[PDB]
């Protein structure tokens, strides 16, 4: 009853939303994106997302496929394994469809805690 359920959802989305830019900039160069931290790899032409999987203690960030080259749908997920009771186990998913390059946000949280712009 005292859990910060609405702020948890906003913090989670704020950890993955900025990565859309990172992904688009890499694909515009014809480079692939790979998860984790590190330096660009000029041999394989892969750019890391630049954020650790556990950057936000509310949960974990994941990329699929990994690496991703733009020719298949890409998903960025924030799994709230560190959240309070109402949001623990819930997942915010950002999907970039390869056929049109568009992004969508879906969440399996209770409707009242889904961040603005995301749907069930």
Swiss-Prot record:
Keywords: Disulfide bond, Fimbrium, Membrane, Methylation, Transmembrane, Transmembrane helix
Topology with respect to the bilayer: Single-pass membrane protein
Keyword set includes Membrane: yes
Subcellular location: Fimbrium; Membrane
Gene Ontology annotations of biological process type: cell adhesion; type IV pilus-dependent motility
GO cellular component: membrane; type IV pilus
Family statement drawn from the similarity comment of this UniProt entry: Belongs to the N-Me-Phe pilin family.
Subunit structure: The pili are polar flexible filaments of about 5.4 nanometers diameter and 2.5 micrometers average length; they consist of only a single polypeptide chain arranged in a helical configuration of five subunits per turn in the assembled pilus.
Protein name as catalogued: Fimbrial protein
Organism annotation: Pseudomonas aeruginosa
Part of the whole protein covered: 35 to 150 of 150
């Amino acid at each position: 009853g005292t859990e910060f359920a609405r702020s948890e959802g906003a913090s989670a989305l704020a950890s993955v939303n900025p990565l859309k830019t990172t992904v688009e900039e890499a694909l515009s160069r014809g480079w692939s994106v790979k998860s984790g931290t590190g330096t660009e790899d000029a041999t394989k032409k892969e750019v890391p997302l630049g954020v650790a999987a556990d950057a936000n203690k509310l949960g974990t960030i994941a990329l699929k496929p990994d690496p991703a080259d733009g020719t298949a749908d890409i998903t960025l997920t924030f799994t709230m394994g560190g959240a309070g009771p109402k949001n623990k186990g819930k997942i915010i998913t950002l999907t970039r469809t390869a056929a049109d390059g568009l992004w969508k946000c879906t969440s399996d949280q209770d409707e009242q805690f889904i961040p603005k712009g995301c749907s069930r």
